[PDB]
């Protein structure tokens, strides 16, 4: 054990510098430890930075990518040019300063900012945090980020290559529980992906399984599908992953328990944090991460909609018991 200059107790001396970052982020980046756009933007960044890792590319005789090496910040000039990394310039430049200023690696900062950002949203699990990733990285190979226009096979092959199973792909997507879209359908900027974009819960999995009956904007975006109610946006890849035979059962079990969903996500996020790295070579500083406020609310089927409105895609397994909320049907306001 060690006590930092600030008095904080921690499991290792290199966990001490992190208490100053945590202080910085919460105060400025997060405008007061808040669960808004910054946290959602950072979640896109952590996924997009880590996923630039392909053992298959390497085998083919090409640079496969450095995984969670912070190249998205280190080589933003190249990476932010990728169509998948739109609307991230400011989050990146914001993170770059914090990183330099505090002298921490970009790969560690992104991973740290993620665990910290998650704590600002009610119901989030306490994501593990390891420190010690090299500060040096190369730009990520293009075309390594799965898109909403991609097929389930495309997405699973890409994610499988990176090291994730179909079930883990579903688990990582629990992140869409705190999300919205700004560039898929600009007409309805920031339309939430679920009824609670500020609460880490199972609503995302539940609501994506409801029958698509609503077009929230003047038109149906390129990679957009009908949603269950006004204000909610449904991404084509999410709609397909929820119903595909290869992933439907995992998606289905992720609707009943907030704790289980949280467990699986944390296990998945911990997997993604060390892509291109050796766990043994990193120092655990998980104790620097604050706990998120509890989510006592239980899973429910929104606005007078019943379980019979759910398009059950894994009938081989019993559909979980979930409370049903009375109407009227909701109309989501844009994500804060
Ligand atoms: C596996 C296939 C995935 C696809 C196809 C996908 C796609 C997308 C897209 C196209 C948007 C809309 C961005 C915009 O127009 O603002 C979005 C939002 C978001 N995504 Fe994903 N995603 C995937 C996985 C993940 C993962 C694994 C994480 C992190 C663990 C993540 C976190 C987020 C968050 C928090 C937003 C919200 C951003 C905001 O409100 O500005 N996604 N995603
Ligand atoms: Ca990277
Ligand atoms: Ca939610």
């Amino acid at each position: 054990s060690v006590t930092c200059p600030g008095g904080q107790s921690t499991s290792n001396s290199q966990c001490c510098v992190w208490f100053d970052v945590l202080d910085d982020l919460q105060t400025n980046f997060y405008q007061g430890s808040k669960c808004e756009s910054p946290v959602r933007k950072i979640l896109r960044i952590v996924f997009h930075d880590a996923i630039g890792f392909s053992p298959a590319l390497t085998a083919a005789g090409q640079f496969g990518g450095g995984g969670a090496d912070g190249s998205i910040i280190a080589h933003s000039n190249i990476e932010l040019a990728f169509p998948a990394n739109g609307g991230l310039t400011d989050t990146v430049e914001a993170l770059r300063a914090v990183g330099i200023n505090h002298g921490v690696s970009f790969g560690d900062l992104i991973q740290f900012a993620t665990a910290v950002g998650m704590s600002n949203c009610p119901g989030s699990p306490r994501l593990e945090f390891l420190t010690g990733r090299s500060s040096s990285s190369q730009p990520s190979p293009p075309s390594l980020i799965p898109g909403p226009g991609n097929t389930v096979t495309a997405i699973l092959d890409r994610m499988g290559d990176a090291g994730f199973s179909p079930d883990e792909v579903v688990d990582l997507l629990a992140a869409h529980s705190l999300a919205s879209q700004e560039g898929l359908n600009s007409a309805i900027f920031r339309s939430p992906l679920d009824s609670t974009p500020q609460v880490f819960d199972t609503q995302f999995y539940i609501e994506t399984l409801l029958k698509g009956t609503t077009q929230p904007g003047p038109s149906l975006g390129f990679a957009e599908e009908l949603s269950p109610f006004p204000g909610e946006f449904r991404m084509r890849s999410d709609a397909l992953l929820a119903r595909d035979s290869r992933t439907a059962c995992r998606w289905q079990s992720m609707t009943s328990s907030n704790e289980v969903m949280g467990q699986r996500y944390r296990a998945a996020m911990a997997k993604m944090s060390v892509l291109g790295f050796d766990r043994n070579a990193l120092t655990d500083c998980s104790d620097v991460i604050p706990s998120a406020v509890s989510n006592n609310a239980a899973p429910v089927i929104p606005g007078g909609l019943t379980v019979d409105d759910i398009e059950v895609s894994c009938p081989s397994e019993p559909f979980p018991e979930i409370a049903a909320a009375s109407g009227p049907l909701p109309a989501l306001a844009p994500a804060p």
Side-chain angles (χ1 to χ4, degrees), residues 247-334:
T247 46
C249 297
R250 184 67 160 188
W251 200 284
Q252 180 169 301
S253 59
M254 284 292 242
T255 59
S256 66
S257 161
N258 284 313
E259 86 120 322
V260 170
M261 176 190 67
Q263 292 181 165
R264 301 175 171 175
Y265 176 72
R266 182 174 184 289
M269 289 302 266
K271 183 86 176 301
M272 195 171 86
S273 65
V274 300
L275 284 185
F277 294 95
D278 170 48
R279 213 184 191 68
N280 287 300
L282 302 164
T283 295
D284 194 328
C285 285
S286 294
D287 65 19
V288 176
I289 307 301
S291 292
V293 307
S294 306
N295 172 194
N296 300 308
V300 308
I301 304 182
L305 299 170
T306 58
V307 68
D308 295 332
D309 191 40
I310 286 297
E311 309 192 298
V312 170
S313 303
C314 177
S316 62
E317 296 302 333
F319 192 84
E321 296 270 298
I322 163 185
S326 184
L329 205 65
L332 310 189

Side-chain angles (χ1 to χ4, degrees), residues 48-72:
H48 292 188
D49 181 44
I51 202 61
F53 177 74
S54 170
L57 250 180
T58 302
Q62 286 290 313
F63 174 54
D69 62 5
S71 60
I72 190 174

Side-chain angles (χ1 to χ4, degrees), residues 150-157 237 240-241 244 246-247:
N150 290 171
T151 67
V152 175
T153 297
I155 294 175
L156 291 182
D157 292 4
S237 50
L240 295 168
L241 286 166
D244 194 285
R246 297 167 280 185
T247 46

Side-chain angles (χ1 to χ4, degrees), residues 40-319:
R40 304 194 301 274
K41 293 289 188 185
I42 239 295
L43 281 173
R44 285 185 58 211
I45 289 173
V46 67
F47 173 47
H48 292 188
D49 181 44
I51 202 61
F53 177 74
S54 170
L57 250 180
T58 302
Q62 286 290 313
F63 174 54
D69 62 5
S71 60
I72 190 174
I73 302 176
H75 301 285
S76 54
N77 36 76
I78 294 175
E79 291 192 37
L80 267 56
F82 300 163
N85 295 313
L88 299 176
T89 304
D90 299 313
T91 306
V92 175
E93 293 315 312
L95 289 174
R96 186 195 305 295
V98 179
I100 305 169
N101 293 35
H102 288 271
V104 297
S105 76
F106 293 147
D108 283 355
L109 174 60
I110 294 177
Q111 296 297 318
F112 184 74
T114 290
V116 172
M118 290 280 83
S119 79
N120 296 179
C121 313
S124 306
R126 220 168 66 104
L127 304 181
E128 158 190 285
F129 175 64
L130 306 180
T131 187
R133 302 180 185 75
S134 179
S135 304
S136 57
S137 78
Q138 299 195 300
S140 174
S143 301
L144 289 181
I145 305 174
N150 290 171
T151 67
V152 175
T153 297
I155 294 175
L156 291 182
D157 292 4
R158 180 67 273 287
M159 294 290 279
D161 170 50
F164 300 107
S165 65
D167 266 33
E168 298 183 302
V169 170
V170 172
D171 300 341
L172 268 316
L173 274 170
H176 278 190
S177 187
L178 304 176
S180 75
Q181 66 73 30
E182 309 189 323
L184 295 180
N185 193 325
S186 58
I188 58 179
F189 174 82
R190 284 191 179 176
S191 53
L193 271 40
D194 89 356
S195 58
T196 49
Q198 283 190 301
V199 179
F200 186 73
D201 52 24
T202 65
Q203 290 311 120
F204 166 67
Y205 295 104
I206 292 171
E207 303 172 11
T208 54
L209 273 172
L210 288 170
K211 290 167 186 172
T213 71
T214 314
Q215 176 182 290
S219 68
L220 214 56
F222 193 83
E224 162 176 31
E225 307 209 321
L226 294 174
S227 79
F229 34 89
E232 180 162 299
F233 184 101
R234 180 174 294 184
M235 197 180 304
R236 181 171 179 272
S237 50
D238 281 349
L240 295 168
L241 286 166
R243 298 160 176 74
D244 194 285
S245 69
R246 297 167 280 185
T247 46
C249 297
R250 184 67 160 188
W251 200 284
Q252 180 169 301
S253 59
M254 284 292 242
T255 59
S256 66
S257 161
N258 284 313
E259 86 120 322
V260 170
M261 176 190 67
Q263 292 181 165
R264 301 175 171 175
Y265 176 72
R266 182 174 184 289
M269 289 302 266
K271 183 86 176 301
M272 195 171 86
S273 65
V274 300
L275 284 185
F277 294 95
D278 170 48
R279 213 184 191 68
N280 287 300
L282 302 164
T283 295
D284 194 328
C285 285
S286 294
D287 65 19
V288 176
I289 307 301
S291 292
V293 307
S294 306
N295 172 194
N296 300 308
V300 308
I301 304 182
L305 299 170
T306 58
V307 68
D308 295 332
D309 191 40
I310 286 297
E311 309 192 298
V312 170
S313 303
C314 177
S316 62
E317 296 302 333
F319 192 84

